[PDB]
């Protein structure tokens, strides 16, 4: 009854951040020792709780979100951040508790040339943990678009140009966000003790 962090972290293909992936971890024993003791990560930023002291504490449920962005934007996967990714693709709340783990994947998600997308246009910011997978033509003017790209009518999504010779900020990074729920229900996710 081991919690399946491996099929999230070691997945061969990741999701695009506009349609970010979420895994619901429940009813299992979680070993975070494999996470914080590894040397594979570029950033490991935890808020409100430290990964070394979860090995002895229990939650209702855990959520593991996963997606690919560019390094420039890993700054934005954090409470109190703004920018295209934090505002229109993936938003963490201000009172977020949990971890943001991120590592370079230029050798896996760069060829010679991409496949990942992100939302460019949205009339308002996302609520925390909202996922908008629309592909409706963005109406930036008064005249309705009727589903055809053109003037004042833009496709809301745009592809990253992931290419192995870019600078590291332009290179793809895989990001996993662990969030810990603790409503007052039976706690099902636990450390080894």
């Amino acid at each position: 009854n081991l919690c399946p962090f491996g099929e999230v972290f070691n997945a061969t293909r990741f999701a695009s951040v506009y349609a970010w992936n979420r895994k619901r971890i429940s009813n299992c024993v979680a070993d975070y020792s494999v996470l914080y003791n590894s040397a594979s990560f570029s950033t490991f930023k935890c808020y409100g709780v430290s990964p070394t002291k979860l090995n002895d504490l229990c939650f209702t449920n855990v959520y593991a979100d996963s997606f690919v962005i560019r390094g420039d934007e890993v700054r934005q996967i954090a409470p109190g951040q703004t920018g295209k990714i934090a505002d229109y693709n993936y938003k963490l709340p201000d009172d977020f508790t949990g971890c943001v783990i991120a590592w370079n994947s230029n050798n896996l998600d760069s060829k010679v040339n991409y496949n990942y997308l992100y939302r460019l246009f949205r009339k308002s910011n996302l609520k925390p943990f909202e996922r908008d997978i629309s592909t409706e033509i963005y109406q930036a003017g008064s005249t309705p678009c009727n589903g055809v790209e053109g003037f004042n009518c833009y496709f809301p999504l745009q592809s990253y140009g992931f290419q192995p010779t870019n600078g590291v900020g332009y290179q793809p990074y895989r990001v996993v966000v662990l969030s810990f729920e603790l409503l007052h229900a039976p706690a099902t996710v636990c450390g080894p003790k």
């Epitope: 420039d72 505002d87 246009f121 009339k123 308002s124 963005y138 930036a140 833009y154 140009g161 870019n166």
Partner: antibody, heavy 117, light 108 residues
Framework: QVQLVESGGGLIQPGGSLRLSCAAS????????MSWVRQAPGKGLEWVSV???????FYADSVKGRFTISRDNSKSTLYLQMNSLRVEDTAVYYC???????????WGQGTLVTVSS | EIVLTQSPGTLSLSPGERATLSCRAS??????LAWYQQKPGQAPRLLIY???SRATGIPDRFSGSGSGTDFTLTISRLEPEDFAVYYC?????????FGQGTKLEIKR
């Protein structure tokens, strides 16, 4: 047919304040990125600030803390509030429609700001 | 802060010939670069985005090339108002920065 018209430029003492306005038509201000970009007399272009379609706002380091971009959907107008002005701010300021914080596909005619004593 | 250097400072060409401007980047912006044309007293006009794509209403004689750190703008058959200043601008990393321009003059 997009139209962008700036106003509010003039002479102002160093340390004083101005408010530049840009009336826009042909698109919805509330749903587009918009930016102020300035050009000193006979010199290059410098991006000053941006407001995102969702409201988020960003500034160049040279003006961060002194400038504030804002918008009014009711009046379809973009504002740049300039405080504690320095002589280095003397320039023609351009209101510009912004394609997703990438490039400026439509520009206003500009308004001239002369900071001097 | 990504610095873009345009080359050369000025170019003087005759009507009919074709002009090639260059822009080089402090770091690599990978295609995120645009070209603007500004005539005296007027505002910049968008010429090319994505380093390759013409804007609306831009005639076909304007063409964009390059990527990485090096980009070029070419005008195929120069005509009597192609004569202005031309700016390159990156949008790969913040803050967005321009080159300092190259002035295109006529030779009649």
């Amino acid at each position: 047919q997009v139209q962008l018209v700036e106003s509010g430029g003039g002479l102002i003492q160093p340390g004083g304040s101005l408010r530049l306005s840009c009336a826009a038509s042909g698109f919805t201000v509330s749903s587009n990125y918009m930016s102020w970009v300035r050009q000193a007399p006979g010199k290059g272009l410098e991006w000053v600030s941006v407001i995102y379609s969702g409201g988020s706002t960003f500034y160049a380091d040279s003006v961060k803390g002194r400038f504030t971009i804002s918008r009014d959907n009711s009046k379809s107008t973009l504002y740049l509030q300039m405080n504690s002005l320095r002589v280095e701010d003397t320039a023609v300021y351009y209101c510009a429609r912004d394609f997703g914080d990438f490039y400026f596909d439509y520009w206003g005619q500009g308004t001239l700001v002369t900071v001097s004593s | 802060e990504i610095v873009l250097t345009q080359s050369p400072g000025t170019l003087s060409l005759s009507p009919g010939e074709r002009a090639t401007l260059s822009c080089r980047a402090s770091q690599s912006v990978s295609s995120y670069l645009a070209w603007y044309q500004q005539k005296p007293g007027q505002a910049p006009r968008l010429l090319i985005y994505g380093a390759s794509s013409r804007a609306t209403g831009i005639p076909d004689r304007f063409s964009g090339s390059g990527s990485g750190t090096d980009f070029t703008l070419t005008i195929s058959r120069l005509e009597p108002e192609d004569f202005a200043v031309y700016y390159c601008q990156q949008y790969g990393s913040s803050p967005r920065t321009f080159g300092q321009g190259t002035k295109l003059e006529i030779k009649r």
